[PDB]
Design an enzyme around this catalytic site. Structure first.
Site, mmCIF file in Angstrom:
data_model
loop_
_atom_site.group_PDB
_atom_site.id
_atom_site.type_symbol
_atom_site.label_atom_id
_atom_site.label_comp_id
_atom_site.label_asym_id
_atom_site.label_seq_id
_atom_site.Cartn_x
_atom_site.Cartn_y
_atom_site.Cartn_z
ATOM 1 N N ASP A 130 0.838 -1.198 0.000
ATOM 2 C CA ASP A 130 0.000 0.000 0.000
ATOM 3 C C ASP A 130 0.874 1.250 0.000
ATOM 4 O OD1 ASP A 130 -1.936 1.932 0.266
ATOM 5 O OD2 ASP A 130 -2.484 1.368 2.321
ATOM 6 N N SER B 280 -0.807 15.792 -11.900
ATOM 7 C CA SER B 280 -1.017 15.433 -13.294
ATOM 8 C C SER B 280 -1.295 16.686 -14.114
ATOM 9 C CB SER B 280 -2.187 14.438 -13.406
ATOM 10 O OG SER B 280 -2.597 14.239 -14.742
HETATM 11 O O1 LIG Z 1 -12.528 -4.014 1.886
HETATM 12 C C1 LIG Z 1 -11.479 -4.844 1.561
HETATM 13 C C2 LIG Z 1 -11.553 -6.124 2.354
HETATM 14 N N1 LIG Z 1 -11.022 -5.740 3.689
HETATM 15 C C3 LIG Z 1 -10.470 -4.372 3.571
HETATM 16 C C4 LIG Z 1 -10.111 -4.292 2.076
HETATM 17 O O2 LIG Z 1 -9.867 -3.020 1.600
HETATM 18 C C5 LIG Z 1 -8.709 -2.377 2.049
HETATM 19 C C6 LIG Z 1 -7.446 -2.748 1.612
HETATM 20 C C7 LIG Z 1 -6.327 -2.041 2.060
HETATM 21 C C8 LIG Z 1 -6.497 -0.966 2.937
HETATM 22 C C9 LIG Z 1 -7.765 -0.607 3.359
HETATM 23 C C10 LIG Z 1 -8.884 -1.300 2.915
#
Ligand code: A1CDQ
Ligand code: A1CDQ
Length: 330
Positions: A35, A199
């Site tokens: 992330d 951008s």
């Molecule tokens: O909703 C989806 C299933 N559990 C959470 C996921 O989404 C995320 C992925 C990364 C960071 C925040 C949320």
């Protein structure tokens, strides 16, 4: 040093991507969501409330000879979609694609929100934004990239996400065989802790390019492309029957449609998102209303170049003293 790991879509929609990560001694392999919009490495664990674990692989620090409690440290995070998690902290050895960091903060979840429990494919997150966003208290901790940076051949990592297919995260080198043409680099502001850039504009389908500055973040942890309401309206106006639905929570369109492409500017260069990348399928099983992959950022407070946009490019996250982002077609 360098590292190279394959990243794989969790489902048929590319809702997220998982990358295997080795934690501890002997290794415990967990599938983490890398992330670039957050800065905590957290995992489901032997400490997670049992009723909140449903199919995930867990980290058990008591089985790792290199794990050490980071005494007194706690963490707690909330994401842009309202999901959350919290717990305590260990340090341990963490390896990604052959690249090893010793003493990495591994944040062990005691609690996770239902959205995490309900997704058995994601065992935790590995944050790759700037360490100023890390939530560990009272002593803030560094990301895997920040810890690895000095050892890397070059202080960079790259994201090459696939469309309905696996891709690659590389650390410490640019794979010049992985893209076409040249890489265009653009300035980054770290003032909010994100890979934030501007951008130079957009086009819809075969239409003319509109020169306009769009500030936003490169965020591998967000599924969709979130842009100003003016831009998003101009896109969906080219799709017969598309509309914004308050009940569904965004733009929907007839599943019978063929979607136009969307182009975004990087300096004088252009990245083209094919129309198919913007189709997120029926809103519910069997529906003929489909969910759009370009949505308004008006309710967020920031524009987000999520996976829909990033998977159309080879993306360089350059963590030199003055950070920059690079984009190439592929
Ligand atoms: O909703 C989806 C299933 N559990 C959470 C996921 O989404 C995320 C992925 C990364 C960071 C925040 C949320
Ligand atoms: O695990 C489930 C399969 N599709 C839905 C759920 O996961 C996610 C949904 C949205 C974003 C990230 C993950």
């Amino acid at each position: 040093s360098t590292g190279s790991a394959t990243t794989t879509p969790i489902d048929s929609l590319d809702d997220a991507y998982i990358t295997p990560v080795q934690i501890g001694t002997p290794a415990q392999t967990l599938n983490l969501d890398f992330d670039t919009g957050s800065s905590d490495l957290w995992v489901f664990s032997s400490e997670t409330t049992a009723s909140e674990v449903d199919g995930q692989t867990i980290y058990t620090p008591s089985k790792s000879t290199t794990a050490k409690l980071l005494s007194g440290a706690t963490w707690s995070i909330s994401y842009g979609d309202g999901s959350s998690s919290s717990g305590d902290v260990y340090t341990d050895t963490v390896s990604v694609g052959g690249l090893t960091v010793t003493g990495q903060a591994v944040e062990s979840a005691k609690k996770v929100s239902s959205s995490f429990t309900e997704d058995s494919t994601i065992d935790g997150l590995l944050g790759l934004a700037f360490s100023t966003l890390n939530t560990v208290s009272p002593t803030q901790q560094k990301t895997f990239f920040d810890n690895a940076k000095a050892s890397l051949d070059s202080p960079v990592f790259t994201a090459d996400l696939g469309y309905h297919a696996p891709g690659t995260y590389n650390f410490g080198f640019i794979d010049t065989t992985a893209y076409t043409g040249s890489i265009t680099y653009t300035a980054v502001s770290t003032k909010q802790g994100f890979w934030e850039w501007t951008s130079t504009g957009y086009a819809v389908g075969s239409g003319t390019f509109k020169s306009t500055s769009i500030d936003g973040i490169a965020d591998t942890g967000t599924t969709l492309l979130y842009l100003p309401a003016t831009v998003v309206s101009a896109y969906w106006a080219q799709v017969s029957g598309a509309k914004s639905s308050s009940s569904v929570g965004g733009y929907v369109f007839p599943c019978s449609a063929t979607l136009p492409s969307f182009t975004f500017g990087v300096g004088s260069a252009r990245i083209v998102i094919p129309g198919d990348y913007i189709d997120f399928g029926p809103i519910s099983t069997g529906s003929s209303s489909c969910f759009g992959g370009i949505q308004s950022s008006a309710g967020i407070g920031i524009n987000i170049f999520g996976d829909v946009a990033l998977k159309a490019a080879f993306v360089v996250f350059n963590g030199a003293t003055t950070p920059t982002l690079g984009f190439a077609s592929k």
